[PDB]
Design a protein around this ligand. Structure first.
Ligand code: CO1
Ligand code: CO1
Lengths: 339, 232, 331, 215, 53
């Protein structure tokens, strides 16, 4: 009975974990921030309409410039826009048309991409020949690339649908570390501001806190009822949001090691598919399947505004690194830039 | 390994015709807006013509307008300058210069080797100093003042610094008076404001000697400076 | 004091030739008030029915605008919008005192070539609404027929021939009627009518009416008819020229479409014929009526010391056209 | 605009033109999602008609693209919405596994799940009933009644196969929006691809006559 | 069987964490959100003179 006793020990130890994280939960975050004055109503006007794609755009990532963004659609091409003038600076034809993710390097030299082809292909923008060229094809995943995030021009963490996150080395093209704790397709991914440890949300309805250097699940955050399709760190780095198919966002704290509050509403029943905090982290952006975005007061859980501009469900959503604009991107093949 | 090779130079009789061919090989030629700039036998550089990517836009210098015809064959990777009724003021070495224009691009980055052709309102860039001797290891400061303010409304201040070493083709150093060109050492630093610009070189070595040209890119006559020459 | 069909006015252009004291009265003297009221009620009836059918079509299109904005079909929405605007322009006559503001000046004379901008602009605005709505709807119908022809040419393949002709369609169909109406306004042929209760082109000089109406309508008949015959012939030939035994359902839908196109083509032809017949009857009767009326009034002058059916048939032709454009969406 | 912003806008317009041309060129190829039960006769139909696997073949001036996706072991509900707006869904069912473990009921589950999905509410299904020649003789030895106990018919091929066809064509709940084109995969030269071509031209004609607002 | 052992060792390495009370981890979130309220161009919409969109 060395299996049954071990499973029973696992259950008792999970009960201990729940008892511990219950013992240090005295005041609900909502109750502490009851006296904070609200942010009123936040009215955002679509400034730009980046209109080039001919299919459902699946991902989008701002450059650290806060001016260049890259959007990847399923027409088989990802475009690099100049957001300030709505100009296209590059149009990169992909080998595989099926794309679920897209990342822009923090330096701005490289752009990663991946989808149902299981390969995270990295493109070299700043070349001597003036044409965007495929640098590497990071193969080794057995699922499908659900998210990619650049650490440096050398390292990249990838989130596949084979229940494993992997840290790559672009030059060698081999996996450095394989993070394997999930029991469901890992749908989203978010780097800490310092890139010392990241967090991944899986179809297991549980987010996990990984360490990039060790490769060990530090903490596991449960609470969601369905697949979690979006993760984003709080700008502090000691909290992250989690969008699920429950149509609820939850803000977990890393130090408290539990959820603080939930961003639910009665007439919201469509599964959220993208989250992002503002620069200060006060208002939490949230991209629903209602074909509109929402703006939650991330300290009070009361809704502040609605970015309703899209004819189809918003896939991608990103706040600029200077917190100047958000860029929603939906299946109507348009991605607006609100402000 | 990008290479621009000009061919079609030689001695021509005045009022004749000639065609120069710049055969590009080693980059996406179809994506690059290509220029022609000439240099009189002992004078500074001078812009001649420009044809954009897809041949959808052309300009000419007022001196060579009507007489010269620029054209490119993108499939064959060749740039032409069909020049007619050659005057005694066209005896100059002609460079074909690639330039790509998008947000954060470095136009005029690579220059052709140059072909020798011999025959039998706009902005003015003033390089006050025309000669300054210098010993290696020191710090040198080259100045260039414009007539019109090159600081555009969008924030970009379009001024380019080129260096032409003896018996060479000029190479891009700094584009928009701040940004260092790719493969240039961090000794060269661009500074200044509208209608006042300065290229400072810290720890000068025996490779920086030559002529430093000051080009504006605000509007489309492209006017170079007279050129500051470094000696020892 | 002057004769019965002349009202005492002082406006310089208003008076009749060699009679400065009075021009022409408000109501068309050739018709009796009984015919006026009967025609007004008839126009109200068919104008309202046309408006209703066109608004129903507009409502059906706008209710699902996202998935129902496929371009070869939305031309029907545009034709129906044009005809709805036309019907509104027609019913704008029906309002207390608006008919006197629309058919006559502030002096009392009926409006004769009245782009003036002196006293009132209502005649011009209603004329432009009616005429532009009609001509835009008609040219839109011809563009629709062309779109159908070119679409059926590429039936059973993924090659879309209308990938980059939506802009060109819009430009042409919104340009031609605008050029025509502004040309008519520049020539200043806009006359008024009491029984019609609107302003229209070339009442006095039927040359300009004949030109600006029957030339576009004749032209669109020829072009529409040609493209429609080519479309039906294509749909007929597809059954044989398809190399892959098209199913009984596909054949059934092609045959039902050919039937609809055939009957609709014959309906458009019928309406153009009715128009032309009515216009020519009026062109012929006017030459006799201008004399017979003056003789009938000279009778009373010396004692002191038309057919309403053809009007109704012509307005029926236009409103029936509007309803036959509306009936396309009945699924 | 300045001298460089104008050239940047020109580049933007030129790559936008190339993007549009690539879009209109790639949008004229008919796309077909290739599904099927685990280890069904997918290999036979993918080899006869010529991560994710894409096979591009042409037949009578019509360029087909079949996306054999069944090689992917993950949550099918998490990437299936990528394949909405596909022309047809080629669904092959191994007719010979009516008894093996059952597997026929599992293929029925998959068919029922994908035919009545949110995304494929209008995309017609081309159902292939392959491995006909084995099923021909297999029923004479093993009765079909073990798979369908509510089947009171002759134990012969022409009735049993027609019963399986009727049981599959029953599972669709919207018989007005979407059609189901069934074929019994034959070893004849080009009859399989011919049937695919026929079904695809049929759905294309219906889509075009819907686009004309005439149907 | 060894997979269950791995899960037990994971939960053991996950159970020995130094938690802080929500009363403190909430105060920190609130203090951070408050301290950077002026550097949030979405909270307080900057004038069109400095808004690059
Ligand atoms: C037919 C014609 C044009 C009508 C316009 O189309 C409208 C708008 C109805 C009308 C307008 C003025 C009328 C004339 C006015 C004056 C006279 C003089 C009188 O002695 C005898 C009668 C006589 C000659 C009338 C006959 C009918 C005329 C010519
Ligand atoms: C509305 C209609 C245009 C028809 C449209 O082209 C279509 C689609 C056929 C216009 C054109 C000529 C006008 C007629 C010409 C002149 C007259 C004489 C007037 O005393 C009484 C009125 C009367 C008879 C008009 C009624 C309205 C008519 C029929």
């Amino acid at each position: 009975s060395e299996l049954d006793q071990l499973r029973q020990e696992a259950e008792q130890l999970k009960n201990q974990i729940r008892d511990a994280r219950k013992a240090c939960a005295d005041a609900t975050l909502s109750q502490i921030t009851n006296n904070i004055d609200p942010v009123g109503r936040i009215q955002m006007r679509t400034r730009r309409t980046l209109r080039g794609h001919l299919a459902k755009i699946y991902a989008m990532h701002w450059g650290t410039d806060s001016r260049l963004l890259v959007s990847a659609s399923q027409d088989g091409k990802l475009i690099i826009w100049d957001s300030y003038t709505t100009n296209k600076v590059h149009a990169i034809p992909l080998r595989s048309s099926w794309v679920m993710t897209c990342a822009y390097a923090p330096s701005g030299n490289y752009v990663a991409c991946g989808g149902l082809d299981n390969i995270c292909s990295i493109y070299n923008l700043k070349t001597r020949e003036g044409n965007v060229r495929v640098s590497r094809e990071l193969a080794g995943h057995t699922g499908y690339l659900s998210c990619c995030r650049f650490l440096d021009d050398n390292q990249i963490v990838t989130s596949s649908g084979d229940t494993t996150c992997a840290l790559w080395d672009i030059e060698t093209g081999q996996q450095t570390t394989t993070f394997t704790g999930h029991t469901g397709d890992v749908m989203s991914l978010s780097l800490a501001p310092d890139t010392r440890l990241f967090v991944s949300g899986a179809c297991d309805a549980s987010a996990k806190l990984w360490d990039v250097r060790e490769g060990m699940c530090r903490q596991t955050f449960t609470g969601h009822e369905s697949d979690i399709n979006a993760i984003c760190f709080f700008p502090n780095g000691n909290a992250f949001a989690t969008g699920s198919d429950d149509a609820t966002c939850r803000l977990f704290d890393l130090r408290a090691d539990q959820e603080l509050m939930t961003y639910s509403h009665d007439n919201i029943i469509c599964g959220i598919t993208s989250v992002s905090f503002s620069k200060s982290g006060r208002l939490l952006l949230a991209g629903y399947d209602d074909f509109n975005c929402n703006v939650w007061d991330a300290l009070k859980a009361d809704r502040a505004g609605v970015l309703a501009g899209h004819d189809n469900r918003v896939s991608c959503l990103g706040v600029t690194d200077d917190g100047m604009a958000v860029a929603t991107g939906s299946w109507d093949s348009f991605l607006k830039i609100w402000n | 390994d990008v290479q621009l090779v000009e061919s079609g130079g030689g001695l021509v009789q005045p009022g004749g015709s000639r065609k120069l061919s710049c055969s590009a090989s080693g980059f996406a030629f179809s994506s690059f807006g290509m220029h022609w700039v000439r240099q009189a036998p002992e004078k500074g550089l001078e812009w001649v013509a420009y044809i954009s990517s897809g041949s959808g836009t052309i300009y000419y210098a007022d001196t060579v307008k009507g007489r010269f015809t620029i054209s490119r064959d993108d499939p064959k990777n060749t740039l032409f300058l069909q020049m007619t009724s050659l005057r005694s003021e066209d005896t100059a070495m002609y460079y074909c210069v690639r330039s790509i224009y998008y947000y954060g691009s470095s136009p005029f980055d690579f220059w052709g080797q140059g072909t020798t052709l011999t025959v039998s309102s706009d902005i003015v860039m003033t390089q006050a100093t025309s000669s300054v001797p210098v010993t290696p290891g020191e710090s040198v400061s080259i100045s260039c003042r414009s007539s019109k303010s090159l600081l555009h409304s969008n924030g970009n201040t379009y001024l380019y610094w080129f260096l032409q070493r003896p018996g060479q083709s000029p190479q891009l150093l700094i584009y928009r008076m701040s940004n260092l060109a790719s493969g240039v050492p961090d000794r060269f630093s661009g500074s200044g404001s509208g209608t006042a610009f300065t290229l400072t070189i810290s720890r000068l070595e025996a490779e920086d000697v030559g002529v430093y040209y000051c080009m504006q890119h605000l509007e489309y006559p492209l006017t170079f400076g007279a050129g500051t020459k470094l000696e020892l | 004091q002057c004769e019965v069909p002349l009202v005492r006015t002082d406006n310089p252009k208003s008076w009749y030739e060699d009679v400065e004291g009075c021009g022409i009265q408000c109501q068309n003297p050739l018709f009796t008030e009984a015919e006026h009221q009967d025609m007004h009620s008839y126009i109200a009836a068919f104008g309202a029915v046309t408006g209703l059918c066109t608004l129903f079509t507009l409502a059906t299109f706008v209710a699902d605008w996202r998935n129902s904005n496929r371009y070869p079909a939305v031309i029907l929405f545009y034709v129906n919008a044009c005809f709805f605007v036309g019907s509104i322009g027609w019913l704008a006559q029906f309002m207390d005192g608006a008919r006197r503001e629309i058919v006559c000046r502030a002096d009392g004379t009926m409006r004769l070539g009245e782009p003036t901008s002196n006293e009132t602009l209502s005649c011009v605005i209603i004329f432009v609404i009616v005429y532009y709505a009609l001509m835009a709807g008609v040219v839109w119908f011809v563009v629709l027929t062309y779109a159908w022809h070119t679409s059926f040419k590429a039936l059973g393949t993924t090659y879309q021939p209308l990938s980059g002709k939506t802009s060109y369609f819009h430009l042409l169909t919104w340009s031609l009627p605008f050029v025509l109406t502004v040309a008519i306004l520049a020539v200043a042929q806009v006359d008024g009518d009491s029984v019609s209760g609107i302003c229209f082109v070339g009442y006095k000089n039927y040359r300009y009416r004949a030109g600006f109406v029957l030339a576009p309508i004749g032209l669109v008949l020829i072009v529409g008819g040609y493209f429609l015959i080519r479309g039906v012939m294509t749909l007929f030939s597809i059954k044989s020229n398809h190399p892959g035994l098209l199913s009984e359902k596909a054949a059934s839908k092609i045959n039902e479409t050919m039937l609809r196109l055939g009957i609709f083509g014959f309906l458009a032809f019928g309406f153009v014929l009715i128009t032309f017949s009515c216009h020519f009857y009026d062109f012929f009767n006017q030459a006799e009526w201008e004399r017979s009326f003056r003789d009938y009034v000279l009778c009373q002058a010396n004692v002191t010391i038309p057919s309403l059916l053809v009007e109704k048939i012509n307005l029926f032709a236009m409103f029936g056209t509007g309803i036959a454009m509306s009936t396309w969406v009945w699924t | 605009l300045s001298a460089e912003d104008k050239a940047a806008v020109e580049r933007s317009k030129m790559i936008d033109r190339n993007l549009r041309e690539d879009g209109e060129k790639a949008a004229r190829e008919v796309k077909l999602l290739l599904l099927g039960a685990g280890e069904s006769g997918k290999s036979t139909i993918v080899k006869q008609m010529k991560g994710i696997v894409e096979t591009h073949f042409t037949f009578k001036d019509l360029h087909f693209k079949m996306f054999d996706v069944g090689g992917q072991r993950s949550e099918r509900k998490k990437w299936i919405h990528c394949f909405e707006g596909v022309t047809a869904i080629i669904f092959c069912v191994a007719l010979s596994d009516y008894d093996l473990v059952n597997r026929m009921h599992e293929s029925m589950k998959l068919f029922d799940s994908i035919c009545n999905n949110k995304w494929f509410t209008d995309t017609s299904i081309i159902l292939f009933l392959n491995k006909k020649d084995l099923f021909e003789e297999k029923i004479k030895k093993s009765p079909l009644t073990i798979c369908y106990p509510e089947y009171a018919g002759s134990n012969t091929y022409e009735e049993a196969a027609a019963y399986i066809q009727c049981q599959f064509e029953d599972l669709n709940k919207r018989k007005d929006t979407k059609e189901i084109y069934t074929h019994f995969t034959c070893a004849t030269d080009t009859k399989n691809v011919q049937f695919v071509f026929d079904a695809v031209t049929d759905v294309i004609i219906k889509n075009n006559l819907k686009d004309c607002g005439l149907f | 069987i060894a997979q269950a052992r791995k899960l037990v060792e994971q939960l053991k390495m996950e159970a020995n964490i130094d938690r802080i009370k929500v009363s403190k981890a909430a105060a920190d979130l609130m203090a951070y959100c408050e301290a950077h309220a002026k550097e949030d161009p979405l909270l307080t919409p900057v004038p069109a003179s400095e808004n690059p969109f």
